[PDB]
């Protein structure tokens, strides 16, 4: 029950982007991929969540349309796929097994990736 992501993506601003997080040894189609932010010198903030089985997506109102993510059921992999870059995206990011749909639990998140560093 494991996860892997791309390494640091250090570059100048403006260019279109993607980064991937892959789940393995677990039922990847059947738990959402939720996300979190940490910029340099900052706490934690929430980006959104996407369902692997059918791509039902609930992007945070703080980010909606300023972001895009997708998922493929076959290679057990999901991705940020953003249309450009922003100085203010320069952060460590995250992926996880998600909240809700547990037969009970809200929090749920108990399977986690190694992190990735998008950086202008």
């Amino acid at each position: 029950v494991q996860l892997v992501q791309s390494g640091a993506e250090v570059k100048k601003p403006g260019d279109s982007l993607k980064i991937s997080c892959k789940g393995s040894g677990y039922k990847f189609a059947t738990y959402w991929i939720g996300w979190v932010r940490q910029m340099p010198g900052k706490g934690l903030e929430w980006m959104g969540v996407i369902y692997p089985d059918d791509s039902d997506t609930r992007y945070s109102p703080s980010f909606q349309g300023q972001v895009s993510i997708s998922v493929d059921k076959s290679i057990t992999t999901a991705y940020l796929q953003w249309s450009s870059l922003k100085a203010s995206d320069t952060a460590i990011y995250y992926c996880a097994r998600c909240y809700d749909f547990w037969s009970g639990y809200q929090f749920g998140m108990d399977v986690w990736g190694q992190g990735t560093t998008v950086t202008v």
Binding site: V36, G43, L44, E45, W46, M47, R58, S60, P61, S62, I92, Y94, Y99, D100, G104, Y105, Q106, F107, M109, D110, W112, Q114, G115
Partner: protein
Amino acid sequence: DIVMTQSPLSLPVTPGETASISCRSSQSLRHDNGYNYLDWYLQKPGQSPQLLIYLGSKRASGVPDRFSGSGSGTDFTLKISRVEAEDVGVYYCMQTLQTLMFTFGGGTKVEIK
């Protein structure tokens, strides 16, 4: 609503002593299905945040049993009896508002004496 309680923030603490953390805000925090949802977690330096779960803190993993908690109303509790020298980590509690809102605890972390 808002960045919820840190309670406490952070102070130099000596090993093997005692601490606790309190999760609260103006929000109602207990839906009528009657569990409270407060959604604790914790994280060491070097990432991987750690299940401390919905019920005013709880868990279902091998994370050390020096961490435990409960509560009521809008105001909920997690406890750190035996503040062990390895736990130089950060404690957080999480919202409940579905697709709306985007908020977590205000950066409560260990410092040493």
